[PDB]
Amino acid sequence: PIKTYHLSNLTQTELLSLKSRPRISVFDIVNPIVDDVHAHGDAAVKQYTSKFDKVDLENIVELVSDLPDPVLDPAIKEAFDVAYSNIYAFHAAQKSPEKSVENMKGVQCKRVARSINSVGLYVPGGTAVLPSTALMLAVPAQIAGCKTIVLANPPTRDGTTCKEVLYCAKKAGVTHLLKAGGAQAISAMAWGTETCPKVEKIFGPGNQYVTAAKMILQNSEAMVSIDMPAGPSEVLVIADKHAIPSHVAADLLSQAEHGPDSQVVLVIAGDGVDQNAIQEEVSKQCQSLPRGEFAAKALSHSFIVHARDMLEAITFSNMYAPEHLIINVKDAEKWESFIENAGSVFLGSWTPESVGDYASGTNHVLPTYGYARMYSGVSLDSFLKYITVQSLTEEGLRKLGPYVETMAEVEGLEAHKRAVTLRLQDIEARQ
Amino acid sequence: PIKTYHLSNLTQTELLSLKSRPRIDFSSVFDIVNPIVDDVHAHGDAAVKQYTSKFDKVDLENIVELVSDLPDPVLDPAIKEAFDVAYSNIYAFHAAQKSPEKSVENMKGVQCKRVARSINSVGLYVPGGTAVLPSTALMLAVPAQIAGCKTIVLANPPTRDGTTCKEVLYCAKKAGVTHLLKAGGAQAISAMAWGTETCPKVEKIFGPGNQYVTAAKMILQNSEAMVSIDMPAGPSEVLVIADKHAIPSHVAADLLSQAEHGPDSQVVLVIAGDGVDQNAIQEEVSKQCQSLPRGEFAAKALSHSFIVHARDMLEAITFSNMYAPEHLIINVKDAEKWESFIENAGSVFLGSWTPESVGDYASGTNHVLPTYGYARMYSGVSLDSFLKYITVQSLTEEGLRKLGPYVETMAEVEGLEAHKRAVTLRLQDIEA
Ligand SMILES: N[C@H](CO)Cc1c[nH]c[nH+]1
Ligand SMILES: N[C@H](CO)Cc1c[nH]c[nH+]1
Ligand SMILES: [Zn+2]
Ligand SMILES: [Zn+2]
């Protein structure tokens, strides 16, 4: 059965242990791959693609324009169109109006949005089918107006990429498909090749080799940033005595099935909760799951924390900073103001995380590992730069400029002072 | 004389090489900086003290002080009035970036929203030694203050005599800084990232610094320290676009304003169109630089600076977007009309009466901005830099009945039966 803790008892040391996921080295094997793709373009990408993926491709980048539209079963198409629709609407609503701030008359300042010109989106491939991720990444890129959108998705063993991913890629305006994975794919995007466009920002979780390539390349002469660390998936469920045990169990298992390193945490808030029934439901439901071996492995390092009340339970969750938080408690919505650290939040009894994973409209590319303490999930803003713009009239300069001279003199920066002084003289000499 | 290029002459390799700043490749700096970081990680306050003694020439018993325990310095009235004006303009501009948090309900019973929450603990790097940078203290502390950050650590190396300057302290107090870390360099960054015996561990570290500070930030964002950073914000850069209507002495003063920051600064002049007297700008630069206290720094920055001729404004702004400057001053006729063409720039100053100095100090925009070409994908510090945006969703039964079937389909396609069953089990119990 799952390990149980009583929150009031926990020492500082035990709490720090609870908030730390299983630990992380990788950089040694990845750099030669990075450097090689940097030095030898596509040819090296293909060598690593034969070794690691067992696929011989002559054309590792396709213009998505040149690809035929995939053939989908109509129920599948319909569902992906609903996901697109909701994700599009949710992300499109994040556009900021851009208004002038004019505190001092003649001193006009504004913040404007510009798209990142070129972006790379990594979606695991081969046997993986992750059209959901393709949408979570490409839809905001589409909305932001990124000119080049490269999607890295390694092909199946017969040279062909997952058709559901292609469908989503075409719907969301992906320009280039990079039929490749791993660190070779990342480096290809960060550095550019003969046929791969160079990108300015790389998004999307992958394996150790992907994450490592991303982390190396962000600090490199490639001049590239990345979205976040987004490692093994996580869910923290808060449940009280009104939660249905089989539903609580099903939510825990929904993310535990992602892999044996996933982390799942149940916080029981208050009295009257049937922990035996929950445990019982977890074991039974896990036994009948196709991926029950991954889930059982993930549950082997999962845990239950008992909190005296909802306030203590949310306090624990805030310390943990879970990728996903499900709050299955009475009047869940009222607790929103107490949430501090959580990638994405699911409120009430009819909101399994599965809905956010797939089609609610929110983005499932989210910070794991504790990184929700300082990173947000992918959003429209992840694809934008905000440039500040200011303009002064003569009068504006007369009002503000003397303050600036004063401050510059204080810092010992006389040239900063004189850029103002010379202009004020010129204004006086015509006035 | 400043080196000159004509865009229409250059090959692609030549053109692309003008993107390069006068900075060391990152790996060389990581070698210099790594052992410092690990030293502070292993050995705490002792290591920081050792570095502060060696490099800042000061022996401190307390390297961290609680700001509430420090005296309120007394400032000359005019100085005080000027910083209070800057505070007020920076506050107003940043406070206006607060987002409304409207609910989206595409499908009935499917409600989603994005809400802002502050980063709990932040570290702010204010450069020092012979730099006095109270302006940067405001640029960083004011938005932290507006966001609600609970722990705010300000790091600032003690000046020649061995003291944190009083103007930095005034600004820190007015903006709610909680702790002052009286160190600088990569050892300051490490102390904040890892925490020490007396330095709070922070979640995010902000601020401009020299090549070594910047490299420390970049290294620690990949570390097990669990820390993020704002951006690579290194030595200041300005690109000025000037036409025939620009006054040459004003153009020269703008270039020099930022050249004086240090020998590793870079300044670019792009002449747009005809009629510009480049020799007058050059003479004006030379004459002005010779009268500057820091003319030495400025002359060294100018040695890797250059002038580019562009046939028109379109080509000028295209070049600027490639360079991707920290700061862009557009001193051309109808400057405001060119705003739509600007793609990569940290902060832009439009017209003839808008020297970068005003945004450096008090216009209200943020001066902590990406350098090196990082304006291609990073923004300057803003309110959002101090926030996380959490997505929140809630479905009614009706919402789940409508959306849930699509979710089951998608989860089936991906081979994720447990994701499907968290919906199916709810829908079955509804139907029972
Ligand atoms: N739970 C994952 C991280 O948000 C996303 C996902 C995709 N498919 C199923 N789940
Ligand atoms: N130009 C610097 C980087 O934006 C900011 C500054 C402070 N004091 C004078 N200038
Ligand atoms: Zn999932
Ligand atoms: Zn400056």
Author numbering:
A (entry chain A): 42 to 65, 69 to 475
B (entry chain B): 42 to 473
Quote the authors verbatim.
HOL coordinates Zn2+ with N and Nδ atoms. More precisely, the N atom occupies the same position as Wat1 in the MtHDH/IMD complex, whereas the imidazole moiety of HOL is bound in a manner similar to IMD. Like IMD, HOL also forms an H-bond with Glu455*. The O atom of HOL interacts with carbonyl O of His408 and Nε of His368. Upon HOL binding, a significant change takes place in the coordination sphere of Zn2+. The Oε of Gln299 substitutes Wat2, meaning that, in the HOL complex, the metal is coordinated only by the protein and the substrate atoms. One important change is a different conformation of Gln299. In the complex with HOL, where Gln299 no longer binds Ser277, the latter has an altered conformation. Although Gln299 belongs to domain II, this domain shows few conformational changes, whereas the majority of the rearrangements concern domain I. The most prominent movement involves a loop region from Pro273 to Ser277. Other conformational changes involve loop Pro168-Val173 and the loop with the N-terminal side of helix α10, Gly248-Tyr253. Rearrangement of the latter region flips the ψ angle of Pro249 by almost 155°, from −53.8° in the MtHDH/IMD complex to 151.3° in HOL complex.
HDH (EC 1.1.1.23) is a bifunctional enzyme that oxidises L-histidinol (HOL) via L-histidinaldehyde (HAL) into His in two sequential reactions, each coupled with a reduction of one nicotinamide adenine dinucleotide (NAD+) molecule to NADH. We show three crystal structures of Zn2+-bound MtHDH complexed with: (i) imidazole (IMD); (ii) HOL; and (iii) His with NAD+. The three structures reported herein are isomorphous, with three dimers (AB, CD, and EF) forming the asymmetric unit. The MtHDH monomer is composed of four domains.
